[PDB]
């Protein structure tokens, strides 16, 4: 009943969660997290589920992530300024809140650079954790990765301690040593640094989490070390849709359902996955523009201090760095010509994204026209028999049986005969699919509108 | 009993003691000007500046405020033994605020559609500023030892009636 | 002729000095100014003046300290700070 | 030569000083006061004195930029801004108020002094700041300043002369008195306008302390979610001058940290001949180029070795560049702690957050030989709104609620306290429209951006957006009737003919360039060209034409479907054929699901030219029959390598929710009152993200040679810098297209436009529809 | 030799020289090619007579006639559909609606734009979009629409109304930023700062800017209400004066416009965009189905979009290099013979302890969220009423 | 005037209150014309003047010999923070 007050554009196509192929849950009152997610299910969650079972209500738990439905805004019958649901809608946007470009550092060492809304990440932003081992660049919604974005995860690989027998063995087998490609001063400095670190550590040598036997017990193998990457669609901070998944430059693609890769494509073909990967890459590039805010915590703590940053105070030798038409009268120094050329090309493409792209691609008006005028299923469809075998040469599929015409809306079937004047004359077939029969005697012979077709 | 004799240039007794009745009109300017708060920030600070004075009153019982008007009207506007320079300023400050009150009532009587609108606030900011600066200039005139002849109502309305 | 105009304007001077002696300032200034005046050239002159130049010779003394404590403060601050390696106890334990 | 003259500092100074003549401001009020009393012999003296004072004030204001005493005298913003208003008010109220020499000196001094208050300018002061912009980058500063002042003087003289001559070329006494009348009006208007805006250590605004930068000068919200407040401020930098290398040249930074500079000077005073490098500061530094060249050579050597390793029977994954970690013993898999690792945590060292071994730099600092907490304002704290304000509603309820706040500080509604008309304690009555929602008393309330007064008449508060609330005709008509008929639950048997069916079938396959129209229109005007044979193969393949019964041939190559066990209907169709030789439509519940796939295909084609995945049914049934527990505590063990060695019931229950809603119409007695918790996603940590990202490969593991791109060997963060350093000085084709999707030039622009306007455009993620216009306006229509 | 060594050397040479693939003779030939017909010299009378009889037989088949009539009918339907949507909802937007040319479709016909016809339809679209957007912003329940479902709220609101409203919005906001050529961020700026930059030629209409309530960086021209706020008459006068002076300095005649400022119509811009896309597709076709080269194009790395990290990636070591930079470290090593990295690390730790004692972090990104303000006072009223009820009656 | 007697006490000139009222009305009308009265900006920006001063003297010092110390850094600590936090609203 309370929901009936908040649906007043009167949606004609009746969209529902089944059409999105997603499973939602109500969410017990004593639950704090926004979903089920058996990964993070604690003892209190199990107690709540058991209580709901004992009461006689289905908890709605699954082997995967299950979102919880969000509530409707409350209508206070005292304000004299709301008095309605449209009152609530107009009150919501009267609040003095705006998107803010921020740059924060958190106690655990993570950081975020991008736009926020009501102290929650909204829009484009960059999230970094574990000293760069985890990096996300994409769109956000209510502090959740949602939309298009790219995530990078790295598992560290073995590096030999200088002077050790493991280094000698790895050199003997021909593996690459990173410290061999540095200037001698830097190499000696790094050797002394590693010696100092080893001396400071004493006997406190650690075993990382990705070496635990529980990985072998649960999955049959330990996770492999290298580069992990995903570029596609996100929802509820989980991969959801078509995307591309990479592990050490090995490509996987398909449809993802809340972090789970489905075995079938289910509509996410190679082309659609490539399109969504490109969209995610472009979104990550857009989100990267909010990195290194000159007044953020990150810049003050570690960021560069020599960047110009001033709006309109350019030195005589720095006027070329400015945008606008003023740089057309100042030459680029010889040290920067190629880089400036490539940067100018990229900036021109970015500007043409606004100036020229709308004149080539459909816009929201045309998109709405197409959405209201498209035909999902054709009215008439042809049917035939067999994969057309021919047991004289290997396949050479050659059709011999005449096809038939099916009227998909009404489900009727259309058949034709051969006459002299008008090629083939076609008629209604009273029998049809799923089983209809019993003797042909009389026909219908729907007319031809050739006189009306040609005027 | 006296006064006649009548002075030539008033001393600074009356110059200080005659501009007191300009106190409450000075602090009562913003009562009906909250619609102009969207227009001028200084009207916000003026409220908190006059808050201490309106808090000073109230600790005195209401009979004091209700009897101040009668005491002024029939203790200073009656009989002759008082400077005509001082009773004039008393009657200047005693019903200068009656016009403000009348404007306030005719403002509340009007519907809220035209009060909070773009016309009411523009009218009220001008009214408030003009009234405040009129009060300030009257105070300056009192401190200068001369009358305060505001154009329209002063001469007639406040020289005819206070004759005794 | 300046004397005439000055003796006229002194009347207005006394006028508004008493006027803003008799405003809200007058209501807390019964206590304040009465204490100030009942021993004018007396107790307030000798007690409130000290508090008056307390701020003056105060920031004078802070500027003097800035003169005197700017020599080696950073060195001792760095030395007297614990890290993964260095600590004041280690320094003072062995010369 | 007329070319060197143009390219001169003097000419530029004159040119950009002449432009400032097109401005005006309050500074001309006393210039007009010069002419109000020009009647008489002294009027000429008055006029010349006022003009000379104005010119001298402007000249002193110009000179104060580079002269140290004048710069210190007039470099105080707070003092001048505070003192502006009293001067104006006094000057008004007492302009109302020896011969003439004293008056002449007084008017000259007044005109000189008035120019030093840094008045505002109508319509804006941009033209004045253009002169500063060109001052910054010019070479000879004194010549430029004198040229600009001379140009401004010339323009002022010129426009005064021309206006005067044009006025004397072609009521008058009424205006002469009216200007005297309106000087006071203009002065009063200026006083009101300023009143709406007024509120080398010798700089002393420290005595003021009246500005109170910690107060709220903006009509923003008050963040009181539970109690915490003290939210951080966006601005976290400072103002401090220092000389630093920008790219390879010496530049001055106006936002340098003070502690860094203090430490730099302290350590510089201890060692000689380190900063006396004595080479090109303003020009590029040879050290920069040498470092770049060395890095480039090392990178090239490493890249070439990595590539050469491929040709010796090595897998790509065995030569990929990956972040490494120092290992101490592979037998026990014992590594160094990640905090002490120079590779994983090297940069993050030297930065500590609170929730044999003899240092030699200590010896250098103390000037001592080798042996066998003061803070003078160099600290930086996170700026927060330290003021804790409260609303009027916070202390209105009860005769006994005393934290003793004298002033709330936050305006609220007009609610009252008494309700009774005994036993019940307190409820609230407001019943009015509120224009001061939650504003802070400090803010001016005049620049709110969400609530405005838009119309002449208005009674409530409205958001600005919400407030203003010939022979082809027959077949076309039949097509319209048919398409409208599918909406209803009925079809007319005789409405559709054979021609309509053929038209619908033909409209499936599409063509864009030639078409029957182009081919037949180029069929005429013939015997001059030829027709290519490829289109013949195209027509034969599609059955349009070839070279009996062409209708069947056309209705034979229209993508027939495959083996729906045709027998069922075919056994009825054929005998129907020889024996005649002689209204409700399906619902299609999968329509909405197919719509999204059609949209995706449409998008891809535009840019480039049994209900829930039954695989999950057994999984869900097995889990719901007997749930299993994921041991994530054991899997992520030692993730951080530092192991080393009824009132009360209701109030306490609600503390577990960051946000919640209470709604009106215990178990059923609490079933009449609705509690709606709001759950926030704050569980995003590194551990969960890593587990989710790396679980996919593990789960899906137990169930030109190949288009090699050499730069994929390097790490994503290193390939970019390698290229920058260099620049300083059937499924195979599908996979290749997937890998190189962004290589074509137009793809970036097209994908950016699609991301702007084609996906998630109404779900609260993008503001482009309301903020960004769709088409440009500068092109000629 | 070596199959991969040759590829690596080719990549190095390409990155050193960076050739162009979009202007080869093959691509140009494929651009102005013959999609139909292969006009050539006549191969005697037999070939021309064979083509004549082929054309006669082609124009006699009833299938061809039916296809021609169907194409004509489709063209007529498209024309009438375009005619039925020539006016937008608001009368003041008619010129803007009619000025923009239509986008070609898959069949080569202009794509119609849907026009809102009635007040009820506009209200429905406005309310749907506003409800969905606002509920998404504040974490309430929204309808399960697909990511691709479009709602055209801009036409329902009106373009000029949006321009006016957001001009008013912009006039009360500050704290702007823009990107220079290298991609660094310059600011913060006020409206007066933006005017000053615009008048000097430092900032033009094509400069990418970021404001208060926008989600991504956009050019100044595209933002609603920003051009009227900045480009006043005096700002335009100053910009024109600067351009004139610099043009005279460089010897360019004053009447010659600046680069990128030539007057063009909508049709010319659309033609240029379509031609560029066609050229790219022809480049793709000439090489097969793949883009030529072994080195990814520079624009695919987003060098400009990552300009703010250029200094960070240019120099990167395994030490903080904050209080003791590398050069100062080298000088210290010259002065102090046996200098080890741990001493430098300890000094850096001590200095970072003196300033920012333990501070320079904030709480996680969900601890300062309040939600709609009115809900809190509504909850307070509800709890007061509940306390009244629970005790009495 | 006089209805009981005053010999020479001055009478205030009436044009003052007329001027006050006319100015108030004109200010209201002008504000109606241009509501954004806070957008008016001063002729100079103080930080810009300081930057120009420091730039000129720094260039003059580095032209010959010796380093240059900035006078802005010697300003008392809690005036620089005050300007940094108050300039966008008070001194745009």
From TrEMBL, chain C:
<protein>
    <submittedName>
        <fullName>Nucleusenvelope protein</fullName>
    </submittedName>
</protein>
TrEMBL record, chain F:
<dbReference type="GO" id="GO:0005829">
    <property type="term" value="C:cytosol"/>
</dbReference>
<protein>
    <submittedName>
        <fullName>Actin T1-like protein</fullName>
    </submittedName>
</protein>
<dbReference type="GO" id="GO:0030941">
    <property type="term" value="F:chloroplast targeting sequence binding"/>
</dbReference>
<dbReference type="GO" id="GO:0045037">
    <property type="term" value="P:protein import into chloroplast stroma"/>
</dbReference>
<dbReference type="GO" id="GO:0031897">
    <property type="term" value="C:Tic complex"/>
</dbReference>
């Amino acid at each position: 009943f309370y929901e009936d007050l908040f649906d007043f554009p009167r949606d004609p196509e009746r969209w529902k969660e089944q059409d999105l192929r997603e499973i939602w849950a109500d969410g017990p009152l004593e639950m704090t997290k926004p979903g089920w997610d058996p990964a993070w299910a604690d003892e209190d969650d199990w107690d709540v589920v058991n209580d709901e079972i004992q009461e006689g209500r289905d908890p709605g738990i699954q082997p995967f992530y299950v979102p919880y439905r969000k509530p409707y805004p409350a209508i206070p019958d005292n304000h004299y300024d709301i008095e309605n649901a449209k009152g609530v809608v107009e009150e919501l946007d009267r609040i003095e809140e705006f998107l803010q470009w921020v740059s924060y550092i958190f106690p655990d060492g993570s950081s975020y650079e991008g736009t926020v809304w009501d102290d929650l990440a909204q829009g484009k932003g960059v999230y970094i954790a574990e000293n760069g081992l985890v990096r996300y660049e994409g769109e956000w919604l209510q502090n959740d990765m949602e939309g298009h974005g790219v995530i990078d995860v790295d598992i560290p690989d073995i590096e030999p301690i200088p002077g050790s027998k493991l280094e000698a063995k790895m050199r003997a087998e021909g593996r690459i040593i990173k410290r061999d490609y540095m200037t001698p001063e830097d190499r000696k400095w790094l050797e002394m640094d590693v010696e100092d670190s080893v001396a400071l550590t004493d006997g406190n040598f650690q075993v990382p989490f990705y070496e635990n036997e529980e990985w072998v017990t649960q999955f049959g193998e330990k996770p492999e070390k290298g580069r992990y990457r995903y570029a596609g669609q996100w929802k509820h901070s989980r991969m959801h849709g078509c995307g591309v998944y990479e592990v050490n430059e090995r490509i996987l693609y398909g449809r993802f359902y809340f972090g789970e890769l489905l075995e079938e494509e289910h509509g996410c073909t190679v082309d659609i996955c490539a399109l969504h990967s490109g969209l995610a890459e472009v979104a990550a590039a857009k989100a990267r523009m909010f990195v290194n805010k000159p007044d953020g915590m990150i810049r003050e703590e570690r960021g560069p201090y020599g960047d110009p940053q001033h709006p309109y105070f350019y030195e005589e030798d720095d006027v070329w760095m400015a945008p606008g038409f003023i740089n057309q009268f100042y030459e680029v120094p010889e040290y920067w010509e190629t880089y400036v050329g490539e940067v100018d090309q990229e900036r021109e493409m970015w500007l043409n994204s606004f100036y020229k792209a709308p004149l080539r691609l459909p816009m929201p008006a045309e998109l709405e026209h197409w959405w209201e005028n498209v035909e999902v299923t054709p009215e008439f469809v042809l049917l035939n028999k067999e994969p057309e075998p021919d047991p004289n040469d290997p396949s050479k599929l050659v059709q011999k049986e005449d096809p038939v015409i099916l009227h998909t809306p009404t489900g009727r079937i259309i058949n034709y005969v051969e006459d002299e004047k008008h090629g083939i004359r076609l008629f209604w077939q009273p029998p049809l699919e799923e089983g209809e029969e019993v003797d042909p005697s009389k026909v219908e012979f729907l007319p031809l509108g050739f006189d009306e077709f040609y005027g | 009993f006296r006064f006649p004799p009548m002075t030539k240039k008033p001393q600074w007794w009356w110059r200080t003691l005659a501009c007191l009745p300009y106190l409450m009109p000075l602090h009562e300017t913003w009562m009906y000007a909250e619609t102009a708060y969207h227009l001028h920030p200084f009207l916000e600070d003026f409220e908190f500046l006059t808050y201490p004075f309106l808090g000073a009153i109230g600790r005195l019982p209401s009979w004091f405020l209700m009897a101040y008007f009668f005491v002024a009207y029939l203790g200073i506007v009656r009989r002759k033994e008082w400077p005509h320079f001082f009773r004039f300023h008393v009657v200047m400050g005693m019903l200068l605020e009656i016009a403000l009150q009348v404007i306030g009532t005719v403002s509340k009587w009007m519907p809220l559609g035209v009060y909070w609108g773009k016309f009411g606030m523009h009218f009220w900011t001008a009214v408030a500023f003009a009234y405040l600066f009129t009060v300030l200039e009257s105070i300056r005139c009192a401190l200068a030892g001369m009358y305060a002849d505001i154009p329209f109502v002063c001469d007639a309305a406040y020289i005819q009636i206070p004759y005794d | 002729g300046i004397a005439d105009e000055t003796l006229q304007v002194v009347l207005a001077t006394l006028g508004f000095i008493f006027l803003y002696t008799y405003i809200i300032t007058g209501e807390e200034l019964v206590k304040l100014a009465r204490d100030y005046i009942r021993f004018l050239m007396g107790r307030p002159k000798t007690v409130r003046l000290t508090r008056a130049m307390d701020s003056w010779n105060g920031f004078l003394e802070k500027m003097s300290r800035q003169r005197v404590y700017d020599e080696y403060w950073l060195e001792k601050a760095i030395i007297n700070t614990p890290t993964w390696y260095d600590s004041p106890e280690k320094y003072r334990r062995v010369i | 030569l007329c070319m060197k003259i143009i390219n001169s500092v003097v000419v530029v100074g004159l040119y950009y000083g002449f432009l400032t003549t097109f401005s005006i401001g309050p500074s001309y009020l006393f210039l007009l006061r010069a002419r109000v009393m020009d009647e008489g012999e002294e009027g000429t003296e008055k006029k010349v004195s006022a003009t000379t004072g104005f010119i001298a004030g402007q000249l002193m204001m110009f000179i104060s930029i580079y002269y140290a005493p004048l710069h210190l005298a007039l470099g105080r913003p707070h003092t001048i801004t505070v003192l502006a208003l009293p001067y104006l008010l006094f000057h008004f109220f007492w302009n109302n108020h020896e011969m003439r020499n004293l008056r002449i000196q007084c008017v000259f001094l007044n005109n000189l002094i008035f120019q030093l208050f840094n008045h505002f300018i109508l319509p804006s002061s941009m033209l004045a700041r253009l002169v500063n912009i060109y001052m910054f980058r010019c070479n000879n500063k004194m010549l430029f300043v004198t040229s600009s002042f001379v140009g401004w003087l010339i323009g002022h003289i010129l426009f005064m002369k021309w206006v005067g001559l044009v006025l004397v070329w072609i009521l008058v006494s009424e205006l002469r008195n009216s200007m005297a009348r309106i000087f006071s009006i203009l002065l009063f208007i200026t006083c009101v306008y300023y009143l709406g805006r007024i509120p080398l250590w010798f700089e002393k605004p420290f005595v003021t302390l009246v500005f109170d930068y910690k107060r709220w000068n903006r009509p923003n919200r008050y963040i009181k979610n539970d109690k915490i407040e003290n939210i951080v401020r966006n601005e976290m930098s400072q103002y401090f001058f220092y000389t630093c290398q920008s790219d390879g040249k010496e530049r001055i930074s106006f936002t340098y940290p003070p502690n860094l500079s203090t430490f730099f000077e302290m350590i510089q005073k201890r060692i000689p001949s380190f900063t006396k490098e004595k080479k090109t500061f303003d020009q590029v530094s040879t050290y920069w180029s040498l470092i770049h060249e060395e890095k480039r050579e090392n990178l090239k050597k490493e890249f070439l070795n990595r590539i050469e390793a491929l040709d010796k029977e090595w897998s790509v994954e065995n030569i990929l560049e990956k972040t490494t970690r120092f290992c101490y013993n592979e037998a026990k898999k014992e590594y160094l702690p990640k905090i002490y690792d120079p590779f994983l945590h090297g940069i993050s060292r030297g930065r500590i957050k609170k929730l044999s071994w003899i240092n030699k730099i200590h010896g250098l600092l103390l000037k001592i030989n080798y042996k066998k907490m003061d803070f003078p304002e160099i600290n930086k704290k996170v700026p927060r709104w330290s003021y804790k304000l409260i609303s009027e509603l916070e202390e209105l309820e009860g005769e006994n609620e005393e934290n003793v706040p004298m002033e709330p500080g936050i305006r609220s509604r007009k609610a009252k306290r008494v309700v009774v008309f005994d036993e019940m304690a307190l409820i609230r009555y407001s019943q009015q429209s509120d224009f001061r929602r939650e504003i802070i008393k400090g803010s001016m309330r005049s620049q709110r951006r969400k609530t405005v007064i838009w119309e002449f008449f208005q009674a409530k508060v409205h958001s600005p957006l919400f407030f203003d609330r010939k022979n082809t005709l027959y077949f076309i008509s039949t097509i319209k009737n048919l398409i409208s008929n599918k909406k209803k639950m009925s079809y007319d048997l005789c409405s559709l003919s054979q021609a309509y069916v053929f038209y619908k079938l033909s409209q499936i396959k599409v063509s864009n360039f030639c078409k029957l129209k182009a081919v037949l229109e180029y069929n005429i005007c013939i015997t001059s060209f030829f027709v290519k044979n490829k289109i013949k193969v195209f027509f034969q393949e599609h059955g349009i034409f070839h070279y009996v019964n062409q209708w069947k041939n056309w209705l034979r190559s229209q993508y027939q479907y495959n083996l729906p066990q045709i027998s069922w209907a075919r056994l009825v169709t054929q005998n129907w054929k020889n024996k005649i030789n002689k209204a409700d439509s399906l619902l299609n519940p999968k329509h909405n699901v197919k719509k999204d796939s059609i949209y995706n295909l449409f998008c891809y084609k535009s840019i480039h030219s049994f209900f829930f995945f039954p695989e999950f049914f057994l999984f869900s049934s097995t889990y719901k029959m007997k749930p299993w527990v994921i041991p994530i505590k054991l899997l992520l063990l030692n993730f951080n390598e530092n192991i080393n060695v009824t009132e009360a019931e209701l109030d306490l229950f609600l503390t577990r929710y960051s946000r919640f809603q209470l709604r009106w119409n215990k178990l059923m007695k609490k079933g009449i009152l609705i509690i709606e918790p709001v759950r926030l996603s704050v569980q995003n940590d590194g551990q969960l993200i890593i587990y989710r990202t790396i679980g996919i490969s593990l789960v899906h593991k137990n169930k030109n040679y190949d288009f090699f791109v050499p730069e994929k060997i390097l790490s994503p963060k290193r390939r970019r810098e390698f290229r920058i350093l260099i620049c300083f000085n059937k499924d195979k084709n599908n996979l290749i297209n997937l890998k190189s999707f962004l290589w074509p030039n137009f793809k970036l622009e097209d994908l950016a436009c699609m991301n702007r306007y084609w996906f998630n455009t109404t779900n609260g993620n993008h503001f482009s529809m309301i903020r960004i216009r769709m088409y440009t306006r500068f092109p000629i229509p | 030799p070596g199959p991969y060594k040759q590829i690596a050397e080719q990549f190095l040479w390409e990155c050193e020289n960076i050739p162009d693939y979009r202007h080869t003779p093959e691509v140009d030939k494929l651009l102005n090619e013959d999609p139909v017909f292969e006009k050539k010299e006549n191969p005697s009378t037999e070939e021309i007579e064979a083509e004549q009889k082929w054309w006669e037989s082609f124009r006699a088949s009833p299938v061809v006639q039916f296809m021609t009539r169907a194409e004509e009918i489709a063209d007529d339907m498209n024309k009438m559909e375009l005619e039925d949507n020539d006016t937008p909802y608001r009368k003041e937007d008619k010129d803007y609606w009619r000025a923009i040319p239509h986008v070609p479709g898959f069949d080569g016909r202009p794509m119609p734009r849907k026009a809102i016809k009635s007040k009820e339809e506009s209200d429905d679209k406005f309310w749907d979009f506003m409800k969905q957007f606002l509920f998404g912003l504040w974490g309430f329940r929204q309808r399960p629409y697909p990511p691709g479902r479009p709602i055209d709220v801009a036409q329902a609101i009106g373009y000029k109304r949006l321009e006016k409203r957001y001009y008013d919005f912009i006039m009360k906001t500050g704290g702007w930023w823009y990107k220079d050529r290298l991609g660094r961020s310059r600011g913060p700026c006020e409206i007066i700062t933006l005017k000053t930059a615009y008048g000097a030629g430092i900032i033009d209409r094509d400069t990418f800017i970021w404001g208060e309530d926008m989600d991504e960086w956009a050019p100044i021209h595209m933002v609603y209400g920003l051009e009227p706020a900045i480009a006043t008459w005096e700002v335009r006068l100053g910009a024109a004066a600067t351009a004139f002076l610099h043009k005279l300095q460089k010897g360019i005649p004053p009447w010659v416009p600046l680069k990128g400022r030539e007057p063009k119509t909508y049709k010319q811009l659309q033609k240029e965009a379509i031609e560029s896309k066609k050229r790219d597709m022809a480049v793709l076709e000439a090489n097969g189905g793949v883009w030529p080269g072994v080195r990814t194009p520079s624009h695919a790395l987003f060098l400009w979009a990552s300009g703010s990290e250029l200094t960070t990636v240019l120099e990167s070591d395994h030490m903080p290099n904050k209080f003791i930079p590398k050069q100062l470290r080298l000088e210290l090593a010259k002065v102090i013979p046996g200098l080890r990295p741990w001493e430098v690390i300890s000094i850096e730790q001590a200095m970072d302890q003196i300033s920012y004692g333990g501070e320079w972090y904030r709480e996680p990104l969900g601890t300062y969220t309040t939600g709609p303000p009115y809900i809190r006072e509504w909850n307070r009223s509800v709890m007061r009423l509940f306390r009244i009820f629970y005790n009495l009656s | 005037n006089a209805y009981r007697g005053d010999p020479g006490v001055p009478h205030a000139d009436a044009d003052r209150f007329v001027n006050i009222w006319i100015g108030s009305a004109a200010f209201s009308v002008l504000t109606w014309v241009n509501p954004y009265m806070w957008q008016l900006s001063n002729q100079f920006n103080y930080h810009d003047k300081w930057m120009l001063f420091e730039q000129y003297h720094w260039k003059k010092a580095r032209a010959k010999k010796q380093p240059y110390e900035f006078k802005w850094n010697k300003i008392p600590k809690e005036v620089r923070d005050s300007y940094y936090y108050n300039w966008p609203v008070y001194f745009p």
